[PDB]
Write a protein that holds these residues in place. Structure first.
Motif, PDB file in Angstrom:
ATOM      1  N   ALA A 145     -53.949  64.788 -17.216  1.00 41.86           N
ATOM      2  CA  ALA A 145     -53.341  66.098 -17.703  1.00 41.86           C
ATOM      3  C   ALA A 145     -54.380  66.651 -18.948  1.00 41.86           C
ATOM      4  CB  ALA A 145     -52.237  65.781 -18.591  1.00 41.86           C
TER       5      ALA A 145
ATOM      6  N   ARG B  56     -53.388  67.497 -12.449  1.00 44.64           N
ATOM      7  CA  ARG B  56     -52.195  67.456 -13.379  1.00 44.64           C
ATOM      8  C   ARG B  56     -51.911  68.381 -14.505  1.00 44.64           C
ATOM      9  NH1 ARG B  56     -48.424  62.817 -12.623  1.00 44.64           N
ATOM     10  NH2 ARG B  56     -47.787  63.874 -13.959  1.00 44.64           N
ATOM     11  N   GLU B  57     -51.069  68.255 -15.458  1.00 47.45           N
ATOM     12  CA  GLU B  57     -50.453  69.279 -16.366  1.00 47.45           C
ATOM     13  C   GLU B  57     -51.411  70.051 -17.056  1.00 47.45           C
ATOM     14  OE1 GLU B  57     -49.252  66.071 -16.220  1.00 47.45           O
ATOM     15  OE2 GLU B  57     -47.243  66.074 -16.380  1.00 47.45           O
ATOM     16  N   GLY B  58     -51.735  71.045 -17.224  1.00 48.66           N
ATOM     17  CA  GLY B  58     -52.605  72.025 -17.884  1.00 48.66           C
ATOM     18  C   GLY B  58     -54.032  71.552 -17.848  1.00 48.66           C
ATOM     19  N   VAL B  59     -54.528  71.319 -16.668  1.00 47.85           N
ATOM     20  CA  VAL B  59     -55.926  71.435 -16.351  1.00 47.85           C
ATOM     21  C   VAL B  59     -56.400  72.697 -16.385  1.00 47.85           C
ATOM     22  CG1 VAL B  59     -57.831  70.516 -14.543  1.00 47.85           C
ATOM     23  CG2 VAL B  59     -55.522  68.905 -14.999  1.00 47.85           C
TER      24      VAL B  59
ATOM     25  N   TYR C  38     -50.222  70.731 -11.096  1.00 51.78           N
ATOM     26  CA  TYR C  38     -49.195  70.642 -11.709  1.00 51.78           C
ATOM     27  C   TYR C  38     -48.974  72.006 -12.887  1.00 51.78           C
ATOM     28  CZ  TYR C  38     -47.317  65.849 -10.496  1.00 51.78           C
ATOM     29  OH  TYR C  38     -46.891  65.049  -9.957  1.00 51.78           O
TER      30      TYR C  38
END
Ligand SMILES: C[C@H](NC(=O)CC1CCCCC1)C(=O)Nc1nnn[nH]1
Ligand SMILES: C[C@H](NC(=O)CC1CCCCC1)C(=O)Nc1nnn[nH]1
Ligand SMILES: C[C@H](NC(=O)CC1CCCCC1)C(=O)Nc1nnn[nH]1
Lengths: 256, 257, 257
Positions: free
Chosen positions: C114, C88-91, C58
């Motif tokens: 995330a 997910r977002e910003g890993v 993501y």
């Protein structure tokens, strides 16, 4: 207004007046209300409805699908109100069919950097969610709730009006209105008297609430026993009835 | 060349020799950048901000933003970043507020790790390490060689003493004296970064003067004033202990116990 | 095309035919992406790295950056991610260090939520779940079917046992044995991840064994050798108990009590 480096999906509906920064994506069925300012590197997935005079900051991903396996790719929704502020890298996920299929944020809410609002989380108005505050899913936050930095709120937990979490609080049970909570696990300490003087609550209502607290927490009473005591102060003071009703809607338990 | 053209460099921006700006990075109005500093991709720089020499800012970082603590903001508030700093993926550094210093100050050779936050008006010295998601909550003063473990929270106006160490997931509410190790939420004081002292090439006499200094302040029911008066000799003897006595002396708001 | 034209695909990158890469995503040098895998927008992929088949990564995630760790001097270390994972977002995921085995390994079917962090040389196994902002320090071995709740922290060299579970905001400084439930900062043990076993369909007979095996390590006041010895019998009779006793044997830092 709409930077020529933004991807505004054909099936969007950016009401005029809306600013979009460079390299921002406005996805499928994303209603963006008028007066809003979308920053750069902002991803908006739908179906989503954003209100008016909101501000979404760089690296925020508003309206994605919960990663929760239970959720199986159904066409669910998210609704944000007017006059909110969504800071850098905040994530706000849409609802599930297993509940209301609508994640909902009200008006005038401040949602600070790297905050998370999971699927079906319902936020009222004039709230403050401080850096890295995380709402699990099915979390209700009634108006004027302040959650200090890195507050963790467990599934189905209801955060009462004018309630306050200390930094790094892990909330497992419902927080009654006005109550202040601290630590992991979170524990009731006092009422939010600062938050009352912010509303201009009459010194009677502050004092009637200061009592209403002792009745619940410091007089060795069962919850049902406590609700009966309050009912007259609840009947007289509208403010005490907020606190009374907040307890009464805790099937699972109140934060003690 | 060094400046990527998909980046947005505002006219007023001042880029020095050997500066690199990755693609899609915004260098905002009145952002000054020093010699050989590397800005990665997906970086937002907002001004007025001064960045010094040979720094490295990574992607998704938002450096020099306004604190949301005020909904109607004030200008001009500054962010002064020094030399040889490393600011990792998705760091958030806010500029000062007119109602205090009106500057957020970061010194030299500091390591600020992924998704950490430096709140408005917070001063950071030199050779400090802020581990992943360490968060300073405005008007926070962090002195030199201070190590804040992963996800350390520092309350408004708290002072992080020189060579001090916070355990992971610590919630610092009162001042942390120089060298003192703190742990947990709320953060309690355990011992001293003897490991950190040894790495600095501190004398064993100084480390043993700092061990006996810890006990005066914490372990012997002395008042801060009695405790300070007792440290007078050890402090004048050892500059290393003086840094400790100094840090306790400045704590009007109380020390982490 | 599947490669969105606003993406950067380094000449020396190896992308399988049906690979999707969204806009403003970097796919740097010696980065390999297997068939079916879907890269989202605003992603930074650095190598030398190898991503498997049917993965999803993501927006804002930074997979394959150097550990900011000082002991890392810029060696040619690797990152390897298996098949069917969701990042997910910003890993943030960092390549290894030569100090260990110059590689960071994530297996298959793992869900990584995330703003979660995977430090250098960290081995994540199969069917694991890392909930929002879960941070693994470095040299951390998370075995199969482990569930670390939101904002769980994990110290260097800590080894998370199989089908084990941490509670939200957990801070793990010692090893989590297989199947055990750990909670708080610092982490404490509270019997075993039973519904986790009842989910996958573990044997009624083995669950009684794991329950009586738990009584040995924790509740019978044995030393780790006295307990490892008393387990051998039951541990030979059952695989589940062997894996529990195996996880107990391989605890370098000690076990969470
Ligand atoms: C209102 C303020 N809220 C914050 O969230 C401060 C955070 C600190 C860490 C960095 C992100 C901000 C607060 O006073 N919290 C508190 N004090 N004592 N217990 N809780
Ligand atoms: C300095 C280091 N910092 C870390 O953050 C370790 C992990 C990586 C990042 C996520 C939080 C865990 C540390 O080990 N601190 C510590 N030791 N004992 N108690 N705290
Ligand atoms: C599976 C769940 N994990 C979560 O991460 C849910 C929330 C996501 C973000 C907000 C804070 C936690 C959990 O087990 N929580 C728990 N129960 N008892 N102790 N911890």
């Amino acid at each position: 207004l709409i930077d020529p480096r933004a991807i505004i999906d054909p099936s969007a509906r950016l009401a005029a007046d809306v600013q979009v920064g460079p390299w921002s994506i406005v996805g499928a069925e994303v209603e963006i209300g008028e007066g809003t300012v979308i920053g750069p590197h902002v991803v908006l997935k739908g179906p989503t409805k954003i209100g008016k005079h909101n501000r979404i900051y760089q690296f925020s991903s508003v309206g994605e699908d919960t990663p929760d396996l239970k959720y199986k790719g159904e066409p669910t929704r998210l609704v944000i109100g007017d006059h909110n502020v969504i800071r850098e890298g905040v994530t706000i996920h849409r609802g599930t069919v297993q509940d209301r299929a609508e994640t909902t944020i009200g008006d005038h809410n401040l949602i600070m950097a790297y905050a998370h609002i999971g699927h079906d989380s319902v936020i009222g108005n004039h709230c403050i969610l401080v850096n890295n505050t995380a709402l699990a899913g099915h979390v209700h936050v009634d108006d004027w709730a302040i959650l200090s930095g890195y507050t963790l709120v467990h599934q189905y937990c209801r955060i009462g009006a004018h309630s306050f979490s200390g930094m790094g609080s892990a909330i497992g049970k419902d927080v009654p209105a006005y109550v202040t909570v601290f630590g992991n696990p979170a524990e009731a300490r006092s009422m939010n008297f600062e938050g009352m003087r912010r509303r201009g609550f009459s010194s009677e209502a502050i004092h009637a609430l200061r009592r209403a607290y002792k009745v619940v927490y410091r007089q060795g009473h069962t919850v049902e026993e406590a609700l009966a005591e309050l009912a007259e102060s609840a009947a007289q003071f509208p403010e005490v009835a907020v606190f009374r009703d907040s307890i009464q809607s805790a099937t699972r338990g109140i934060t003690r």
